[PDB]
Enzyme design. Structure first.
Site, short mmCIF file in Angstrom:
data_model
loop_
_atom_site.label_atom_id
_atom_site.label_comp_id
_atom_site.label_asym_id
_atom_site.label_seq_id
_atom_site.Cartn_x
_atom_site.Cartn_y
_atom_site.Cartn_z
N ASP A 19 -6.02 -16.09 -19.51
CA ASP A 19 -6.18 -15.67 -20.57
C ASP A 19 -6.66 -13.88 -20.88
OD1 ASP A 19 -4.40 -16.88 -22.43
OD2 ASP A 19 -6.14 -16.88 -23.87
N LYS A 22 -3.54 -10.55 -18.06
CA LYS A 22 -2.62 -9.84 -16.97
C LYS A 22 -1.31 -9.72 -17.37
CE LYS A 22 -3.74 -13.62 -15.04
NZ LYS A 22 -4.64 -14.30 -15.82
N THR A 23 -0.46 -10.45 -18.24
CA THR A 23 0.84 -10.61 -18.58
C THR A 23 0.94 -9.14 -19.54
OG1 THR A 23 1.24 -12.65 -17.93
CG2 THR A 23 2.63 -11.57 -19.30
N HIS A 83 -4.22 -19.42 -14.74
CA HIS A 83 -4.70 -20.99 -14.88
C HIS A 83 -5.25 -21.73 -13.70
CE1 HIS A 83 -4.97 -24.97 -15.99
NE2 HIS A 83 -4.96 -24.80 -17.38
N1 LIG Z 1 -7.98 -8.06 -28.51
C1 LIG Z 1 -7.29 -8.16 -27.31
N2 LIG Z 1 -6.45 -9.22 -26.99
C2 LIG Z 1 -5.69 -9.04 -25.87
C3 LIG Z 1 -5.71 -8.00 -25.22
N3 LIG Z 1 -4.69 -8.09 -24.20
C4 LIG Z 1 -4.14 -9.35 -24.47
N4 LIG Z 1 -5.08 -10.03 -25.23
C5 LIG Z 1 -4.91 -11.57 -25.64
O1 LIG Z 1 -5.02 -12.11 -24.71
C6 LIG Z 1 -4.44 -13.62 -24.70
C7 LIG Z 1 -3.89 -13.70 -23.44
O2 LIG Z 1 -2.93 -12.72 -22.84
P1 LIG Z 1 -2.26 -12.70 -21.75
O3 LIG Z 1 -1.67 -11.50 -21.23
O4 LIG Z 1 -1.24 -13.75 -21.80
O5 LIG Z 1 -3.24 -13.15 -20.57
P2 LIG Z 1 -2.87 -13.60 -19.22
O6 LIG Z 1 -3.97 -13.34 -18.22
O7 LIG Z 1 -1.58 -13.16 -18.44
N5 LIG Z 1 -2.83 -15.27 -19.08
P3 LIG Z 1 -2.39 -16.16 -18.15
O8 LIG Z 1 -3.87 -16.45 -16.95
O9 LIG Z 1 -2.08 -17.65 -18.48
O10 LIG Z 1 -1.31 -15.61 -17.33
C8 LIG Z 1 -3.09 -13.17 -25.78
O11 LIG Z 1 -3.58 -13.90 -26.90
C9 LIG Z 1 -3.09 -11.65 -25.98
O12 LIG Z 1 -2.79 -11.23 -27.32
C10 LIG Z 1 -6.14 -6.74 -25.55
O13 LIG Z 1 -6.21 -5.65 -24.86
N6 LIG Z 1 -7.09 -6.94 -26.57
MG LIG Z 2 -0.05 -14.33 -17.84
#
Ligand SMILES: Nc1nc2c(ncn2[C@@H]2O[C@H](COP(=O)(O)OP(=O)(O)NP(=O)(O)O)[C@@H](O)[C@H]2O)c(=O)[nH]1
Ligand SMILES: [Mg+2]
Ligand SMILES: [N+]
Length: 403
Positions: A19, A22-23, A83
């Protein structure tokens, strides 16, 4: 269409705790680069986390590959899950990277998979890291930001990355992504969030060097994933490690099966663009003739026929993690059967300790022999990770092949 090489190619990607963003960053990169370069297709959040199981569970599960480019270079970018239950897939992604972007939430600071991804990136040979400190939009206090950076830098030092030297870019993947949605033509200099993405891109351009690659040695491509294209056949994806592959070449599928088998390459693509020739460093999909997707799998290697002999038994020098490094609390004996990770390969192996070595404890540096239950492309000096019951327990390197 057809792939035209105009720029040096480099493989990067995103790692970091669940979370942390990264994505979202992966998506923001495609959008920001696309405004400067018309060859870049934008990739939305949902285009990356596309699988039904990803929507269902709300996390990345599979690695995803996206393309983008700067004026300097062409990039294939592997977005990895954070995860803890999907470390296996993160390792396979990391094994494709010439450089990694470590994404760390400014609001949360480094977390257990921040640490674990750094460690594992190293054990599949990621040579450089850039840090993206994400979610700064959520953090007012500059002192926490400095504290977070400080902690990340020191954590990287712990795994022998040059932590005090890595670029640390502070921004918001989400606010840049949002700005690009509202104006997809947003260029550099128009918006401070988007410019943080450009800061990341510049840092990748200049801090992650183009790797030295051997195109003359026998063809070798570790297999990352395998799928069936309807109407075309079985495609094996991966980063070509060395040498070259052309349509029409016979190749061998090496590892994991009792017998090596041969097939003919019938197509080569990079980001759904036709390659005349795939070469070392290319992130490709290789169409394989006469094999189903049950006859090629992750962890096998495609190789020039007769260039590689798969092995089952080797000697290794191993460090066993302390509990305070995410490792196990207790030790193990001969007969311990953990998982071994070599490049994109994951294989159960049996620890066999020397006569006199009754037990290995956390924090120990030790030598022992390993016997894999399946043959694997191995060679001396190959680094590997050890995991068991869903946790990382050690890191090693092959010292000698035995059988
Ligand atoms: N406030 C804020 N929230 C963010 C930012 N970037 C991502 N988020 C929030 O953080 C959450 C996770 O984003 P995501 O890109 O899915 O993270 P991840 O690291 O890819 N997750 P995973 O480990 O499952 O791949 C989402 O609810 C997203 O909107 C940012 O720059 N600011
Ligand atoms: Mg991701
Ligand atoms: N994904």
């Amino acid at each position: 269409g057809e792939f035209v090489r105009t720029k040096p190619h480099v493989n990067v990607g995103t790692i970091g705790h669940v979370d942390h963003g990264k994505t979202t960053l992966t998506a923001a990169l495609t959008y920001v680069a696309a405004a400067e370069n018309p060859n870049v297709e934008v990739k939305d959040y949902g285009d990356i986390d596309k699988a039904p199981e990803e929507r269902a569970r709300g996390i990345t599960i599979n690695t995803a590959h996206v393309e983008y480019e700067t004026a300097k270079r062409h990039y294939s970018h592997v977005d990895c899950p954070g995860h803890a239950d999907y470390i296996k897939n993160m390792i396979t992604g990391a094994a494709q990277m010439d450089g990694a972007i470590l994404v760390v939430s400014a609001a949360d600071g480094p977390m257990p998979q921040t640490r674990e991804h750094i460690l594992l990136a190293r054990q599949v040979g990621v040579p450089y890291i850039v840090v993206f400190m994400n979610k700064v939009d959520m953090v007012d206090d500059p002192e926490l930001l400095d504290l977070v950076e400080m902690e990340v830098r020191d954590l990287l030092n712990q795994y022998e990355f040059p932590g005090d030297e890595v670029p640390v870019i502070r921004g918001s993947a989400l606010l840049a992504l949002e700005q690009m949605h509202r104006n997809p033509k947003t260029r550099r200099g128009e918006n401070e969030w988007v410019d943080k993405i450009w800061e990341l891109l510049d840092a990748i351009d200049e801090y992650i060097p183009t790797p030295v690659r051997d195109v003359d040695k026998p063809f070798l491509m570790p297999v990352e994933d395998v799928f069936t294209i309807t109407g075309r056949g079985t495609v094996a994806t991966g980063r070509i490690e060395r040498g070259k592959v052309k349509v029409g070449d016979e190749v061998e599928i090496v590892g994991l099966a009792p017998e090596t088998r041969k097939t003919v390459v019938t197509g080569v693509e990079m980001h759904r663009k036709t390659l005349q020739e795939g070469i070392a460093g290319d992130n490709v999909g290789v169409l394989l003739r006469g094999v189903s997707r049950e006859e090629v799998e992750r962890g096998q290697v495609l190789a020039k026929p007769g260039s590689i002999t798969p092995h089952t038994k080797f000697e290794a020098s191993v460090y066993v993690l302390k509990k305070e490094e995410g490792g196990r609390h207790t030790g193990f004996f001969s007969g311990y059967r953990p998982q071994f990770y070599f490049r994109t390969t994951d294989v159960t192996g049996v620890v066999q300790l020397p006569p006199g070595v009754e037990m290995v404890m956390p924090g120990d540096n030790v030598t022992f022999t390993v016997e894999l239950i399946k043959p694997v492309a191995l060679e001396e000096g190959l680094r590997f990770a050890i995991r068991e019951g869903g946790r990382t327990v050690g890191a090693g390197v092959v010292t000698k092949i035995l059988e």
